Each structure stands twice: as structure tokens, then as C-alpha cells.
Amino acid sequence: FQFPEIAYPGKLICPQYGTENKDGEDIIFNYVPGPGTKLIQYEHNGRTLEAITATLVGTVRCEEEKNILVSVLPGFANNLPKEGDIVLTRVTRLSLQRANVEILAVEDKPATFSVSQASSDLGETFRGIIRSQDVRSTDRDRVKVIECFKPGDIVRAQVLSLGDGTNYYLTTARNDLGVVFARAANGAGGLMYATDWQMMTSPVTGATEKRKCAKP
Template sequence: MNLVLPGQVVARGAPNGEGTVKRGDYIISTRTGIFDPEKNSVTYPRKVEETAVLPNVGSIVLARVSRINARQATVNISVVDDVCTKDEFQGVIHVQDIRATEKNKVKVQNSFRPGDIVRALVISLGDGSSYFLTTARNDLGVIFAQSSETGEQMFPVDYQHMQTKSGYTEMRKCAKPILDE
């Protein structure tokens, strides 16, 4: 069983189950939770439903980009320190918090797109409605994206580009992969 996020392709060529939808030949998760390949379903483990997890300063979060503008990206936080949250929290990544270097050259639209899944660090509890996040480290940034043109899943090719299997490339602020050792 694997942790999955909304919009993530979880299977192919099989009937979909609870917490998933079928798009063409793909089964896509509609919620954050644990994917059971035998049932093709995504469910919350009981432990997650009963546990209230709140982001704190220093927490690593996974979030889906919901909207962008020239000054910031707004995200919905669904995983805090490797624990799924039952409720989503809103977060904001300001343009100056996207990269550690060349901050004056950063453009939000070249770093994130709505629907991207981002690994970020909580730097402030924010303004009462949103947590303030940063991706200004090599291990932080976009970890999962679909092409806005072709709809295909994209893979990082360097620190600022992602590419589909068919070769279409888009700009993103990519997170350096974390390899289990």
C-alpha cells in the first residue's frame, strides 16, 4: 500500500474503486490516502482520521498548487511531516521564497502551475488564513506535475525543467529527488 495524493495516477487498465476515478485507461486518486492495489481504492487509514496534524514552523509539507499570480502561489497542504491530514490547510509561497539565489529573476508562472504537487518547508504560521512556505532549498519544489499542454506526467530533467516521455518540456522549480538509502 502506498501514500497517494489527489490527481496522482495509481493504476492502469483496471476498474476503479473508492476514492478514485477512471480517465481513459488510467485510474486517478481523488483524495489523499493509502492506495490498495487489490481493491484499486484510496482510503484514509484509521490512525490518520483520528489524528489532528497541524503544520509547525520547520515542518516539511506536501501541497497541491491551487492558483498562482505574479507575486505568489497558493497551495492546499495535505501532508505534514509524512502524515496525511484529514483536512487541508492553505499555504502561500511568495515569489521571494521560491529560490535561494537569483530571487529577482524568479517568476511564479515559470516555477509552479495549478495542479503541481510541491514539497515545501513551513517558515511561518502566516497571517491567520495561510501558512507561509518556502521552496528555497534543493530538496524542495515540484515533485509531481502534469504537462499543461499534453496532460502527460512530467519528470525532472534539471533543477528548472520537467519533461514528458514524449519530450515536451516545461519550466518548474524542481525538487531534487530524495533517495532512500
């Protein structure tokens, strides 16, 4: 690519704009900053200059989407809950009109996941709230939250809107979303598995608790 492949923080990669000559016509390559890069200003020969500079140690990748995107891939931080993403959460508390949780991991894109490492005994972990209307598409008005989720149960959901900078708004309306892993009696009993979409049973003690289950 006529540009350095390996880049340490502070290493010059490519100028602001670029162009080449092919097929008897000038093709304009537009370089734009990305994750790991930062467009800054340098001075030389008594004249200002703007060039793409890597800010993270790793390899440079030049890709195009249907313009040249310059980004640096390290050998987590970039991953952050955005509208449409699927996120594994754990129920922290149950209220009557809603159910608040905390974000643990986020599903990637083509399964693999991105685990967000944080202290659960502090509160530094991202918190999210699942509305009672976002529990299931069936009968959106009247939904008993006690018979859907449970403190400690793992819930796979999808984030709708970020809202403010405190809580995320999730939903379990579709089939592949709902309580995934759970135990009997708030975790006191044995492991339970998902059979019906609105019923969770335990093939060990024969206990059956009402939850919101996803599709296997």
C-alpha cells in the first residue's frame, strides 16, 4: 500500500488526501481516521500539515465500504452496547413496572462474545433496565414481571435505545431472547433448562418455575 504496515503510537502513516493515475483518469483516495488513529497537525518548512497518525501499537488496515478507511488493529474497549446489539445480562433487582439488570457480555457480528470485565461489588458495571412492555410481544399491556424474570437469572436481550448515560433499555420480545441460565429458588436449588417459551423446568429435582425462555 506504499504505507508502513506496522505502526507504533506516534508513527506517521498517510497524509490527509491522496491520489493516483490509472486508466487515463485521476482517482482520489480519501483518507479518514479510525479506531487507533488520530488526525493531528504537524509543522514543517514553515507550513502547516495534517496527516493520519496511529495512536495504538499494531498493524494498519486499509479497507473500503460501499474512500479509504485507515485503522490500527491491536495484537473490549472499542466494544460498547449500541442499538441493535445482543447483550447477555444478569438480573440485579425486580420492581413491578420494570426490571433492571447489569451488562456482562455483548454478542459480536458474523457464536462469539465480548466479555466486559468489571467489579460487580462496586457498581462500575454498566446497568440496564428492561421495561414491562418490552418483555414479550404477546400482550404488551399486562405482564407479570414476577413470572418472567428472577434475581440472579441470566437474560439474553437486545438494546433498543441507550437513553441517558446511566441505564440501557433492552427487550426480550423476539423468540431468541429471554432467560437463558437459571436455577431453582433464586439459585438455591439445582440447574434449570428451557423447554417452553413461557415455562422453565429442572430435570433433576423435578421443579418447574415460570420464566421467559428463549429458543434453543
